Every structure is written in C-alpha cells, then in structure tokens.
Amino acid sequence: EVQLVESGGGLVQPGRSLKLSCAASGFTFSNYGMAWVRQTPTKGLEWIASISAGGDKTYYGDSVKGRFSISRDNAKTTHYLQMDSLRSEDTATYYCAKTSRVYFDYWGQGVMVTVSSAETTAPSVYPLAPSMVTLGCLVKGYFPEPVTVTWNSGALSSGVHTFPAVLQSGLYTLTSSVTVPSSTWSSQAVTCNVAHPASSTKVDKKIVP
Amino acid sequence: QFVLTQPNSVSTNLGSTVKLSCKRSTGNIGSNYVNWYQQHEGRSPTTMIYRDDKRPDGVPDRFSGSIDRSSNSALLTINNVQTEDEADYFCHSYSSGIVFGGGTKLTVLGQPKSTPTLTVFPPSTEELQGNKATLVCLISDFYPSDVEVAWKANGAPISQGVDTANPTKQGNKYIASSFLRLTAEQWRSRNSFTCQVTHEGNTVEKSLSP
Numbered sequence: 001e002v003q004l005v006e007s008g009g010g011l012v013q014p015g016r017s018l019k020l021s022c023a024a025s026g027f028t029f030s031n032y033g034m035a036w037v038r039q040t041p042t043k044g045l046e047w048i049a050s051i052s053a054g055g056d057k058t059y060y061g062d063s064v065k066g067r068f069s070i071s072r073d074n075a076k077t078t079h080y081l082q083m084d085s086l087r088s089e090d091t092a093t094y095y096c097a098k099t100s101r102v103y104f105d106y107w108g109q110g111v112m113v114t115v116s117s118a119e120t121t122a123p124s125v126y127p128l129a130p131s132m133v134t135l136g137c138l139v140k141g142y143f144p145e146p147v148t149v150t151w152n153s154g155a156l157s158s159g160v161h162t163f164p165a166v167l168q169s170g171l172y173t174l175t176s177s178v179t180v181p182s183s184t185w186s187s188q189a190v191t192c193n194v195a196h197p198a199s200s201t202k203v204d205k206k207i208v209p
Numbered sequence: 210q211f212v213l214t215q216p217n218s219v220s221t222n223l224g225s226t227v228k229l230s231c232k233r234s235t236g237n238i239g240s241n242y243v244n245w246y247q248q249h250e251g252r253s254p255t256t257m258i259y260r261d262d263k264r265p266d267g268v269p270d271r272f273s274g275s276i277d278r279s280s281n282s283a284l285l286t287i288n289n290v291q292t293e294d295e296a297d298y299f300c301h302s303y304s305s306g307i308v309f310g311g312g313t314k315l316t317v318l319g320q321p322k323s324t325p326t327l328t329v330f331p332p333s334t335e336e337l338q339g340n341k342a343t344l345v346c347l348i349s350d351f352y353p354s355d356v357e358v359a360w361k362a363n364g365a366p367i368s369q370g371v372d373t374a375n376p377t378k379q380g381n382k383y384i385a386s387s388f389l390r391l392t393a394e395q396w397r398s399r400n401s402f403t404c405q406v407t408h409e410g411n412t413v414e415k416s417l418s419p
Contacts, residue, residue: 035307045246045254045299047307061306095253103244103259103301110253126333128345134328138336138345161349161379163386166372173372175345175386177328 002026002106004096009111010198011120011144012086020081022096022108029077030054033099036070036081038092039110046092049081050099063089086115114144118170122199123147127192127207128175133185135207136177137192139165142199149176150193156180185209211235213300213310223319225290231283231300231310239276243283244301248312250378254299258285292317292381320381325351325406329415332396342396344389344417346404351376353409354383361403 008020022034036048049070050059058070067086072079083090091114097104121143128136139147149162159179165172176192184190190207212234221227231243243261246254256265258274261283271288283300295317300310325348332342348356354376360367370390376383387404396402397419405414 037309044312045301045309047309050307059306100259102242102303103256104246104254105256105259105265107253107255124336124339126336126343128330128333130330134347136328136330136345136347138330138333138343140336140343161347161384163347163384164374164377166374166386166388168372173343173388175330175347177347 002098004098004106004108006094006096006108006111009094009113011114011116011118013117014087014115016086017082017084018086018113020083020094020096020111020113021078022080023076023078024098025077027098029072030074034070034072034079035097035099035104036094037097037104037107038090038094040092048094051079083113086113088115091115112145116144118143120144120199121171122201123173123194123196123203125192125194125203125205127205128177129207129209131182132179133182134177134179135185135190136175137194137205137207138173138175139194139196140173141171142173142196143171144198145172147172147174147194147196149195151176151178152191153193156184156190210304210306211302211308213302213308215298215300215310215313217311218314218316220316220318221290223290223292223317226286226288227290227315229285229287229298229313229315230280231285233281233283233302236304237278238281238283238302239278241302241304243274243276245274245283245285246299246301247296248299249296257298287315290315290317292320320352322409323350323352323382324411325349325356325408325413327404327406327413327415329404329417331417331419332391332393337393337396340393342391342393344391344396344402344404346387346389346406346415348376348385348387348406349379350382350384351408352382354378355408356383356385357407358385358387359405359407360387360389361405363399363401364403367402 035050096108123142126138162176165174245258248254262274328347330345373387
C-alpha cells in the first residue's frame, strides 16, 4: 500500500537552507505528480510546490517567491524540496503528498522545520515519583520541538499521557505520565525513554520512589 | 488565484446532519474540481471526497459532496454524525495554483461534563542537586475545556514562576499541565505548595510538602 516517508527538516538559521526528502513506495512513482504542502496552527494548509510526473515542469505557491526548488529522482523513487533564503515565517510542518490528477490521494507524516537564530538545547530529564500509581518524567528546557517519550520501551502502553509542552524564555518543557498498578512498580522497574532528535539525545530514566 | 472561504468552526450533536460550506470568491466553483480532506489533531490529512462528489474506498457513505451553483460553493454533507467525525475539514481546488480553504473545525457535542483529576509531583532529588526545583501539576479527564489554573505557597498565591499550557484534547476529554519554578532554597524552606484548578464552578486542588 502507499507509503510516503519525509526526512530532512529540524532547526535552521534565517538566511540558510534546508533540503526535505520524501521517499515513496507502493505505486508506480513515475506515473504521478508530487507536491509539498505546509501547515501552521494559524494559517491552515498552504500549497508550496508541485512537480509533474515526468519531472520537467514545476509550480510554486505565492509565498515561495523564487526561493525554493522542487525536484525528483525517479530512480530513487524520491522527491525533494530545496528551501533557500529561509525566514521565520517558513517555520511550519511540511507534508509531502502524492497526486492523482486533480487531488492529493495520500499524505506523508509531516516533518517540522523551525527557522530560528537559537541553538539546539538538549533537555534535562528528571524522574517523577509520588491500588493505582501514576509516575512521570519531566523533560526540561529543550529546543526545538519535538521530543518523544515512551515507557518500558513501549511495553507500558495504556495509561500513558504525554502533555503538550510549555514555552518559557525560549526553551520547551513537558511532562509525560504513566499509570500502572502498584504491583507493577513493586515487581519491576518502570523506565521512561526520552528522545530529542534535534540534539541526538536518547535518555532512559528509572523511576525511584 | 481565488480564495476558498469556510466557517472556522461548527458544532453539532450526535446523529445529526451537518453541511460544511466552501465558497469560491472569484471564478465559478464548477470550473475546477473541489476536494475535501479530514485532519484529526496531530495527524496527517486523509481524503474524504474528490472530484466534487466521489468517495475513496473506506470512507463511510455518511459523507457526500456536492456543488451549489447559486452560492458559488461546495458542500460536504455529513449525515448521522459520529464522535469520530470531530476533526478539521479542508476544501481544495485550483486554477493557476492550488487553493485551500481555511478549514472548519467540527465539534460533536453530547459528551457529559467531567471534573478534572490532578496529579502533583515534587522536585526530583536530581534536579535539587542542581539548585533548581520544578513543581509539576498534571490536569486530566475534564470536559469542557475551559479551566483556570493557579498556585499557592504556604497557602498564599504565587504567580511569579508559573507556566501553564492551554488545554488540549486527548481522546474524548481534555488535558493540561502547569509548572511552578522555584529556588531549591525556596522549596526546602516552605511548608507546602498547592495547585488549584477551577472548572465549571468547582475547584480541585492538591498540595506538595518538602
């Protein structure tokens, strides 16, 4: 079935460039046009660029203003968005999309692009400890979004709440919690697994009472 | 090239019918196909309608598309509305460029009111080693979303150092969180700290003590 896998975003300084990639499978790639569409919580979906099936015609949205280039490599079943001259207003989630003549039949998972002068900051991770018991992990002072948090490498899946982050003084902070039976914590360790891709951070913390 | 105008939000009840509109400003709506996408919060869009009125395999027949010449608009009709239809719906067309509507956020009403649950956590010994202390308040299981969060220290209000997130949907209910940043000396020195949430005329609170 159809797969579209985005890569290549993350943090970039104003005036610098980034190249996004979409690796596709599950259909004859060279028979279809491809597109990029971005989203901001304020401005909704905004079309950025399209490319013809054969690769030799491109189209761009009004906000691109001659700064971006879309390309495709049919041999590698991938297409690309080269984004030059980036500005704060380009911070967004970027989706790749397959076309079927007149509509977008499948969308990728989206990758975040953050355009900022601030450097990457890795989080500090702190265990949170107090029938049922709720344990937590504080993921403090990171930049940019996102982070991901799992529990016992995914073995604890129900009872997990990961809370949207707060932003203060330029850094993000969030908490994740997991609710387990008392017997779980007394029978085995409970660990949170925090990842912050922008800083290549991966941290495991056991919850100590 | 033109704009597509959608109402920002619509509310409706379980099992009701809603008609979501998408008006083209300039040029005739019928001159280029209109498509519709559903997007759940935090997820990618999926296609509900393409080519004005066609459904992908898998989309319920509760969903149907039409074109209304007289109002220069496309319509997404949802019959027998379900809880899983709560989502943002985007219309899409084109002429010399690709145009999206602003999205309509559909809410399905009927869920009963639920008061918040609080969980509070003290600073970790590892954080206190660093001379910092973050008090954590987790607010969950509440509906509707409107809440006020406040902190107290030895019983009195403390506003400096507070960071609170706006509520966000998780499943059928909302969650939010709040943090009180203190000096490690400020934490060790107090007798207690409290997180208080006000929701629907009720307060819920929990306290932390060193």
